[PDB]
Write a protein of this length. Sequence first.
Length: 147
Amino acid sequence: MNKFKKMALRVIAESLSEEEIAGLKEMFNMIDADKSGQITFEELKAGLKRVGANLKESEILDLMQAADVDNSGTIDYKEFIAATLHLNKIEREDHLFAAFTYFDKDGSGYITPDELQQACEEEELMRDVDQDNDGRIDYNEFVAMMQ
Ligand SMILES: [Ca+2]
Ligand SMILES: [Ca+2]
Ligand SMILES: [Ca+2]
Ligand SMILES: [Ca+2]
């Protein structure tokens, strides 16, 4: 069974599109705030909410411990991807994150008006979408727009 389960997880991972992969990479980088290549518990607690999940602290610790299979005390990129496949709340958003990272041309984590204009080669916009008035659209505001 566990074998079959592992086989299914591999199918899912292999079935991710390259655009979904780029989205997951942006998610990872968003959480890995110091760009160290490794996500710590502190980063995970600060960052999960930004990628649309915001679990309870105890739930985040459970995720951290399950994902950290080499007991590094950190989540690396490969561990992160594997983990998203075990958390519906996150993996269900892979397509939305693919779309967000497409608009977020510079991988800044926020869509700016200039990026909006770049995309429209494809600004009442900002008023209804930018809910916190920082002049940028973050992932959560993007999801809310999509609804
Ligand atoms: Ca880090
Ligand atoms: Ca690890
Ligand atoms: Ca940006
Ligand atoms: Ca904003």
